[PDB]
Amino acid sequence: SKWFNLEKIHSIEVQSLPEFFTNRIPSKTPEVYMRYRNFMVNSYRLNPNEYFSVTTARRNVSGDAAALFRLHKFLTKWGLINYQV
Known part of the structure; x- marks a missing residue:
C-alpha cells in the first residue's frame, strides 16, 4: 500500500472515516485517529x-x-x- 504512510493521513482515510475529521469534536481528531490506526x-x-x-x-x-x-x-x-x- 504505497499510498499509506504511518506519519500521514490520506484522502482515502478522510473520506472513509469522517468521524475523526469534523473539526468540531475535541475527542475525535486526526491525532487521535493516527494513534488508534497506527x-x-x-x-x-x-x-x-x-x-x-x-x-x-x-x-x-x-x-x-x-x-x-x-x-x-x-x-x-x-x-x-x-x-x-
Whole structure:
C-alpha cells in the first residue's frame, strides 16, 4: 500500500472515516485517529501470520469500541491489516 504512510493521513482515510475529521469534536481528531490506526497497523505487522482482531484492539487500546470497530473494518477493507493471514 504505497499510498499509506504511518506519519500521514490520506484522502482515502478522510473520506472513509469522517468521524475523526469534523473539526468540531475535541475527542475525535486526526491525532487521535493516527494513534488508534497506527496501533492496529503496527500490531498486525508484528505478526502478519495471525489475524488481528477487533477484540484484541479493544483490549489493548482505550477508546470508543464502535469507533475502533469501524477503524478495523476500514483497515481490513483497504488491506492495511490481515492481508497475509
